[PDB]
């Protein structure tokens, strides 16, 4: 209700510090989209008006960080619990073949920020890979979301 997983801890710190330069406690509204996009996220302006509409319910002109991911937790938790996983293929699965290959995770990484060669990927996959085909499936990419 108040906190989720380290997922919040990973970006609620940056979504806070990426734009809290004014020293206004939390990050600005007109800039929240950018604190959101500076994270690699590509949201809508209309939803940016939907969230600014939801947060500006107090009238402070700023955006709390521990309570916004919670908004993201509810944007996925109640909508579809089945598609919530398959969307990760929307995240990593590039070749749309069902298997997020080592080039795609690399191409993921490149999109996300890192470049990863052929021999450096044979660790990102093996980490989730059960059979070791070199192309991460659902259950490998999935178990690693629970494995720990």
């Amino acid at each position: 209700a108040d906190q989720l997983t380290e997922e919040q801890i990973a970006e609620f710190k940056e979504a806070f510090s990426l734009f809290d330069k004014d020293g206004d406690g939390t990050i600005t509204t007109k800039e929240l989209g950018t604190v959101m996009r500076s994270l690699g996220q590509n949201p809508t302006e209309a939803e940016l008006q939907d969230m600014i509409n939801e947060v500006d319910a107090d009238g402070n002109g700023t955006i709390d960080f521990p309570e916004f991911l919670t908004m993201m937790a509810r944007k996925m938790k109640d909508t579809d619990s089945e598609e919530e996983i398959r969307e990760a293929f929307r995240v990593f699965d590039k070749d749309g073949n069902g298997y997020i290959s080592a080039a795609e995770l690399r191409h993921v990484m490149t999109n996300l920020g890192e470049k990863l060669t052929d021999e450096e990927v044979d660790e990102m996959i093996r980490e989730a890979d059960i059979d070791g085909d070199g192309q991460v499936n659902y259950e490998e990419f999935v178990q690693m979301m629970t494995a720990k």
Binding site: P43, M144, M145
Partner: peptide
């Protein structure tokens, strides 16, 4: 890290369609 790598990358990008609208 050698045996754990997606576990680290997932925390950053585990969900995208949650805040995405197309």
């Amino acid at each position: 890290t050698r045996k754990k790598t997606f576990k680290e990358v997932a925390n950053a990008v585990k969900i995208s369609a949650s805040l995405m609208g197309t």
